[PDB]
A = this chain, B = another copy of it.
């Protein structure tokens, strides 16, 4: 993601980018002579292409199964005795398998526990949220803050900067925001000086003709 930022020090910029990260980027899912060798590889079976197509196809199939399952599940209850928690638990049975299989095919097992899915079912059916407003949480990757607090690890960011971090940004400052697994590479580019000119066009001067 690209951002615009004013005159902040590199550490304040780091905190700013972290405040942006937990809702901008998708959540980090870790589960997701020489020229002659390159030429030999390029002239081989494009295995990655067909594996990607097959994976996208089976993800679409599991997504369709999940959409149908969640539509049926939410049709298995009416708004009107039974509490929203009991209703979520009663409609989760008709969708637990499809939900689990879609979370497995998209590598989303540790993000969504049965307890969190029940809490979110209760949330949705409490707030008149349709099956699609329920599945918006599970179909896409979603950003970090959407998940459990043990996956945020906000107290474990490291600011790796070639320049001292108390000095503000300038054109070309690159710095890392490292966690245990990934890192945020931040490259700075000064917003260029703009020279606007004013041109006047008469709104009546627009006159068109037939051909081409």
Residues of A within 8 A of B (CB): 45, 47, 50-51
Contact = CB atoms under 8 A, between A and B. Distances in A.
Contact residues of A: prevailing secondary structure: helix
Q: How many copies does the complex hold?
A: 2
A47 B49 CA distance: 11
Contacts of A45: 45, 47, 50-51
A47 B51 CA distance: 10
A5 to B, nearest CB: 45
User: Interface centre among A47, A50, A51, by most B CB within 10 Å?
Assistant: A50
Contacts of A47: 45, 47
Contacts of A50: 45, 50
6 contacts: A45-B45, A45-B47, A45-B50, A45-B51, A47-B47, A50-B50
